[PDB]
Amino acid sequence: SHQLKIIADGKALSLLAAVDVDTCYRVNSIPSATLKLSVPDRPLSSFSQTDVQTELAHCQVGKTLRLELIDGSKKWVLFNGLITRKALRIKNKQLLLTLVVKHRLQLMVDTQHSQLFKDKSEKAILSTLLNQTGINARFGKIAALDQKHEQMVQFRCSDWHFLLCRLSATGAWLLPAIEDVQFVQPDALKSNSAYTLKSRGDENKDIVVKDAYWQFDNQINPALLEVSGWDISKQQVQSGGRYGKIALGKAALSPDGLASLNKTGWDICYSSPLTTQESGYLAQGLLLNQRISGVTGEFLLKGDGRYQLGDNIQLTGFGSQLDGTASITEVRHRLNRRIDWETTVSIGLQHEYLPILDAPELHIATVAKYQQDSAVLNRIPIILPVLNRPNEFLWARLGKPYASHESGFCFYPEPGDEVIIGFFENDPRYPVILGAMHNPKNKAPFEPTQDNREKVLIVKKGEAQQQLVIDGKEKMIRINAGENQIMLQQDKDISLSTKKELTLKAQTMNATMDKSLAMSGKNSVEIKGAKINLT
Amino acid sequence: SHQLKIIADGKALSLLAAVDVDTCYRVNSIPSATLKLSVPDRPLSSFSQTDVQTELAHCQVGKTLRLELIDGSKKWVLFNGLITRKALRIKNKQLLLTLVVKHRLQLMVDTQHSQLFKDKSEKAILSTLLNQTGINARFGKIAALDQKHEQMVQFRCSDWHFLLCRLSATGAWLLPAIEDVQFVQPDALKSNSAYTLKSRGDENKDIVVKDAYWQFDNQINPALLEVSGWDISKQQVQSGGRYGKIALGKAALSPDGLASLNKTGWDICYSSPLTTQESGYLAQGLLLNQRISGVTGEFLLKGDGRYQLGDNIQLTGFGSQLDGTASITEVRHRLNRRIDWETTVSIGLQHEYLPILDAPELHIATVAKYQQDSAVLNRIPIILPVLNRPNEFLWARLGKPYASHESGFCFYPEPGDEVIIGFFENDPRYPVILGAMHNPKNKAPFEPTQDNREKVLIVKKGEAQQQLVIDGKEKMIRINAGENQIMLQQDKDISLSTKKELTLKAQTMNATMDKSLAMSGKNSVEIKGAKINLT
Amino acid sequence: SHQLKIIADGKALSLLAAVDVDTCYRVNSIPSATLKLSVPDRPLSSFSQTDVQTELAHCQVGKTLRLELIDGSKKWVLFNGLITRKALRIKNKQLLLTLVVKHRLQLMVDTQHSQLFKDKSEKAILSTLLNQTGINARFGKIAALDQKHEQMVQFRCSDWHFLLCRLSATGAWLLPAIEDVQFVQPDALKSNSAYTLKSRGDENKDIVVKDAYWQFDNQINPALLEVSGWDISKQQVQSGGRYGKIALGKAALSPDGLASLNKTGWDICYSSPLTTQESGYLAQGLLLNQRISGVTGEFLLKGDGRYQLGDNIQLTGFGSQLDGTASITEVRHRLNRRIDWETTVSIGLQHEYLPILDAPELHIATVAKYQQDSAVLNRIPIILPVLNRPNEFLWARLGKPYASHESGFCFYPEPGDEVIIGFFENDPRYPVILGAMHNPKNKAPFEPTQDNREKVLIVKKGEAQQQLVIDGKEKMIRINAGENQIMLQQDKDISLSTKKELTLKAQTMNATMDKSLAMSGKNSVEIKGAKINLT
């Protein structure tokens, strides 16, 4: 607990001693540090010389930093990360510049870009999310991250804002170490290395404890939680499971216990088509957030600092309400001259996740070319301009007027058409199409006109127009089925106009005209019957 | 003001004396308490024995608690509620465990479930909202709560999050007492019991006052407020009323006065179809929130504590700016040894409501069976899976392409069909349908195909298909009206194919074929006219 | 720095001396003041007399106030604005009433009304936004405010909530002076008046500096930013430009420098149809907010207070990391007796704008009469009831099922029809129509019925109905094209019913009936051919 050294941009510093260090690690967050450091001898008149301004070039913002506290027989490292705030404060004719050093996980909270992960497990997602930034990814045995997605969209949020929105949907911690961040399931954290905290103590081998504190919340505790999502086939709400009572911690320090104030439970019924596997992992994901705020604590220990964010400490010798074993969260350090070196290690975590993943707003999208590899649904492929890649596509269910049992109005839009997409429960994985639009490129066949004469349902490729025209002014219905054949019906008349050949195929036939009748055919008229007569 | 006793889980406590009590009641909130209590004699080595850990089992989280301060000639009760935070803190070789006791109104903020109140007054709503949890409901004479709703949806928010979102839409206070919560209109609170606060004092019968404070805000004050909602019939915006100047308090402590910085007023024009009665009660509901933050105050009194949250105290003898009468809000108590017992009673309240009621996102819904009991509209009944009950139904207006004056494209969806619902101004009482969908259960008649050959408008029950087929590849329009009768029109040809019998009923008739004509009917041909000739 | 005088409601005050003044100006905010003032001699018993309550009538809320500190040879004015909080606090038998004085820019944050600016530049918008309240508008040379809008909607937000949501979309500061607020581009603020801050000092003409502070953030810095919006014609995403590296400040106090932690940059792809000029000004608008939080500082100077919010101060003689020139932001003043008079002037600003402009929710709108002055698009004019003016109209793109290349289902709604509008990326400038509705005024031609017999596509004016009826129960398709002419097709039969005249115009014609054939025409039958025969 003596003589730390600060390596700034690969070069160890000796011009400015540190008068304060506060290193704060934490589960499911970036870890941070804080260096308050000052000059030992240089006055304010002799501060602005060439030697002191040289070292502040090493301390400039964005340079790496690693502070290593030398034990005397070991060399503890405490932090390794980038300078983010360098704030110099000068008063009472002396200066004291603060540093704020942030981990490499703070490199992800900088960016903001939308990206499409189409068919990947979350382990394949979090690999490509951390490899993209430049921090290595150590993994653990997770039962939730081996889960394949048909689509997975990060929609205009940060990379660390997408990260813990996914780590809260699977229920797995983040353990940011010094060299590599590692993921671990909270249940697998048990049976790890175990430092004992005794109320007796009175030994040199035991751990000295000061300022112990623990707190039992029951403000909001679900006793039973289920997350149920829609099933598109066999239209029902299939709940993934009523997952209550997660096994975590040990006796009288478990979040289990602390019985809920309502015995009925909890229920959320998502309307997005979630699978039974995903909503099952989501139910114990949300359950883990509410229960783990129930038991909290902190313990201000001595210096030596071999504690990390994975291990669990047990309380022994205490009262039967206070004893138990729980996983360490949020290791802190402090280095003053008032105190030598301490470690106020803690237990448990808060519930609310600072990230944001959902896009509530409407968008437009161009329908891409044909694809078939989906399951049997009417999902049509779209291209979203908000998504950056114009080559990758998204499935999207089509909303149409009168889509009945087998009797649907089916006019599937052509590739290259513009649509109006909205998202099921604001989820970027589940878009749905609300219509189609015309353009200056894809022109409507008619401008809107005052007392709009014609109302059409015209479908064509440009070589042949198969129309259904209703003229409300001239009181017509023109089935212009092809450009040649018009079946005209006035309000006062009727017609049937052909180009080549007309055909009647019935069993019997009747004609009845009271005023007159005239049949006329040039160049041949034949009338054939087994009994022909004229009356 | 001596010797309070704490009954924890029905058993009065004497092992741990209380070193602090802070009981905070408040209008339109849960009331709370805070007990800091410690052991009188037991050291840390003798803390973990069987006698002390027995009493902490009574102090465990979720147990009821009631603290009763014994006056000596009376027995005041101060609080009755559940333990919610039990936090033990140990430092300097002594421990001091804090309790946080919460009212039975905190039982409602725990839950989160969506529920459908179809046809009930709000008095019938708040009865079934408080009976469901387990707190009795005392009522007062309210002019706003006797208001019937066609629908009323709590959509995935808490019960206390739905409660004051309704108490802010009707403009009525909540008065949480010790034994039963009671509702009261703010205007009916006047002419209640009246404790006088004098600047002269100098008596034993008068009330001793310390640390008086009052504050006059005018940051945002509407001078005139109107809330106007849409009227579906006779399409206009019918405002419920320009309700300004609510009568509350008395002279120079009324929120009236403190003239607005803008004289023009305030206007919100909701697009949801609110009634004229509801938007009238909403206008003085929102007006009550802005004005009541205008005049605020607090008065730190002596011990005896006969003040409750309903009565109003008048100031007399003060300056003519400072005098007046206003309803007591937010009674507090404190019990130290530095002070004996005090009551820092207050006046007025803040404006923002911590609850949340609105669902902005899209959903899907299955259309239920036929119902008729609505007023004359095209509202079709739907079943929402996000709502828990599959038996109860919701009306929903139908969005269709080209719904004109009397000339509408009317294809009302069958019962059992899936729709795309969105909500008018995000209101769960007003859904609207944006389309209909196909399914693996309700299959589309055709898969989407590359260069999609056919475009259909087919309507059927499965025994008979009445179609309107346009084949864009083979350049046809096939009016397959029934499975037998096809009216074919090629791009180069035409046809009219029948099964049984064709009919012509005109006045005159013409046929004109320039290349050839042939009529053929087997087994009989008859031609009848008053003048028959062949040319 | 002696003897300020406070003019309250046009009348200078002398009954109550001021024991504290804190005047806080700030760029892109309202400026404020705070007056703690107390009585010099009047006791509490003699506080409530007629002379002291007279002066508090001048100090009442909403009265104007102007405090003028008299230098002795000059007369500095410091503030001019309205009383907003008057809070009297009385304790220890003495009172000390606080005033909170707010600028005339606080008059705009009061209101909340929706308004439609159809065709105006932002300079013509901010003129009519400040003239409406009653504060004059001084302008500067802005390259962004001379930008014409096809539409511009303030949708149910405050006037100051619409103001800086527009000043952040153009990237121009607000400089609130004492007499007139002035706008200025941040780049044009350079080469202004320049007060030098020296580390040497040691003169009477130089500026005395205490408590200097500066802070370099790099928490979130875009290295390159582009904002790309949709182009309706030639459907693509045309980015306005990759505007990085804004020129502001000078060397070692510029936001340029402090290199980003990610070198890749930043990208947002809006789906709303923004122009190339608007998204270009939006890219340097958002870039200005992130970079200007990078360099911050504050300098506690002496009294005399000739500094204003526009000028820039340079640091000279300091270290080469610390020197530089940057524009003054957030001038403060303090007037105690402990300190004589100070001015803790600052540099740089925070990033997040407290205002709110976007309406995510659905609405309804009545389609207005015909208008033509748009560019070539299918935008149809609507009237929004949420917008206050029923005379002004909004364009809105129409969403229709199957709007293909030139083959669109075109049923443009009549004027006076009700629609379902949603907004592209929640933007009130870009609505889009999702359907049309029936009414009690615009009645559907049929009530929805159980086992709904008929499905119609009927278009009419009331004098003549041109229908397309499919009866699913009676298994018919009735092309009631006009009220007289019905083309009936049963499931077992067919018909063709006319009123006046039928016509066949083909080249060849065939009839084929296997059971029987009968043609009948009363009062005349003619059969004409070049070769007539009967077989």
Side-chain angles (χ1 to χ4, degrees), chain A residues 502-510, chain B residues 479-488 495-504, chain C residues 487-496 510-514 516:
Chain A
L502 201 140
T503 304
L504 263 49
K505 300 190 75 60
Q507 272 183 183
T508 78
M509 203 272 265
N510 314 316
Chain B
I479 314 296
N480 187 206
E483 211 152 35
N484 308 267
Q485 285 83 3
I486 290 93
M487 182 168 303
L488 192 43
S495 158
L496 201 155
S497 159
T498 310
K499 182 187 186 301
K500 291 201 173 185
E501 181 173 358
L502 201 140
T503 304
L504 263 49
Chain C
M487 182 168 303
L488 192 43
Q489 311 192 241
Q490 275 271 337
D491 198 86
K492 63 171 179 59
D493 279 36
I494 207 167
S495 158
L496 201 155
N510 314 316
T512 311
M513 264 70 61
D514 54 307
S516 65

Side-chain angles (χ1 to χ4, degrees), chain B residues 211-221 230 232-233 235 237 261-262 266-269 271 318-322 370 376-377 397-412 423-426 432 455 459 461 463-464 466-467 479 481-485 487 496 498 500-535, chain C residues 47-48 53 60-61 84-91 106-107 109-112 156 361-364 366 385-386 388 401-402 411 414 417-418 420 435-440 442-452 455-460 470 472 475 477 487 489-521 523-529 532:
Chain B
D211 284 330
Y213 173 74
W214 40 76
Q215 173 167 220
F216 302 100
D217 293 23
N218 209 336
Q219 291 200 346
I220 288 171
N221 268 122
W230 180 264
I232 318 182
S233 50
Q235 281 168 336
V237 194
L261 315 170
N262 281 319
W266 209 288
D267 184 25
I268 46 179
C269 276
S271 182
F318 274 74
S320 84
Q321 178 47 71
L322 323 170
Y370 192 80
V376 181
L377 280 168
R397 318 203 51 202
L398 168 65
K400 45 178 87 170
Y402 190 63
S404 195
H405 166 259
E406 212 182 356
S407 45
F409 171 87
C410 310
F411 277 70
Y412 294 114
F423 302 98
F424 278 152
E425 224 183 282
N426 294 165
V432 74
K455 326 287 193 67
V459 44
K461 203 159 268 293
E463 50 179 357
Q466 291 86 255
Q467 310 183 2
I479 314 296
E483 211 152 35
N484 308 267
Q485 285 83 3
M487 182 168 303
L496 201 155
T498 310
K500 291 201 173 185
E501 181 173 358
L502 201 140
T503 304
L504 263 49
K505 300 190 75 60
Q507 272 183 183
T508 78
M509 203 272 265
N510 314 316
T512 311
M513 264 70 61
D514 54 307
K515 275 185 67 65
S516 64
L517 164 64
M519 176 151 295
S520 316
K522 292 155 195 181
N523 182 280
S524 179
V525 168
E526 205 278 336
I527 290 147
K528 172 171 191 166
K531 177 153 52 197
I532 168 65
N533 46 354
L534 307 177
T535 62
Chain C
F47 168 70
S48 285
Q53 288 309 309
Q60 267 173 356
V61 200
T84 298
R85 285 193 212 169
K86 182 186 65 175
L88 192 148
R89 168 63 161 263
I90 168 173
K91 54 171 196 174
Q106 200 266 337
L107 203 79
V109 75
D110 184 78
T111 187
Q112 188 196 236
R156 252 189 285 150
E361 65 264 351
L362 271 76
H363 299 90
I364 49 188
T366 49
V386 194
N388 285 4
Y402 189 63
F411 277 70
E414 66 155 329
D417 205 350
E418 178 187 307
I420 305 300
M437 309 262 268
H438 281 299
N439 221 55
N442 282 16
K443 306 176 181 175
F446 299 98
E447 231 31 57
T449 59
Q450 48 179 357
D451 187 5
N452 40 0
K455 326 287 193 67
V456 290
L457 176 42
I458 163 174
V459 44
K460 79 187 225 183
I470 308 168
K475 316 208 172 293
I477 287 191
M487 182 168 303
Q489 311 192 241
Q490 275 271 337
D491 198 86
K492 63 171 179 59
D493 279 36
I494 207 167
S495 158
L496 201 155
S497 159
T498 310
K499 182 187 186 301
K500 291 201 173 185
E501 181 173 358
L502 201 140
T503 304
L504 263 49
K505 300 190 75 60
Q507 272 183 183
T508 78
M509 203 272 265
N510 314 316
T512 311
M513 264 70 61
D514 54 307
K515 275 185 67 65
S516 65
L517 164 64
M519 176 151 295
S520 316
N523 182 280
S524 179
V525 168
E526 205 278 336
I527 290 147
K528 172 171 191 166
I532 168 65

Side-chain angles (χ1 to χ4, degrees), chain C residues 15 83 215 280 308 489 507:
Chain C
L15 187 50
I83 295 294
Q215 173 167 220
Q308 280 157 270
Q489 311 192 241
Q507 272 183 183

Side-chain angles (χ1 to χ4, degrees), chain A residues 197 203-210 300-303 307:
Chain A
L197 295 174
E203 277 185 312
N204 265 269
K205 298 179 292 297
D206 212 9
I207 307 178
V208 182
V209 53
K210 297 183 288 294
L300 195 139
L301 303 172
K302 216 162 196 186
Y307 322 104

Side-chain angles (χ1 to χ4, degrees), chain B residues 230 235-237 269, chain C residues 116 366-369 371 382-394:
Chain B
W230 180 264
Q235 281 168 336
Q236 280 172 1
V237 194
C269 276
Chain C
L116 169 63
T366 49
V367 173
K369 313 186 63 190
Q371 271 94 63
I382 65 171
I383 282 180
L384 252 177
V386 194
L387 273 298
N388 285 4
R389 305 203 158 196
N391 303 325
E392 285 218 89
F393 71 104
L394 283 79

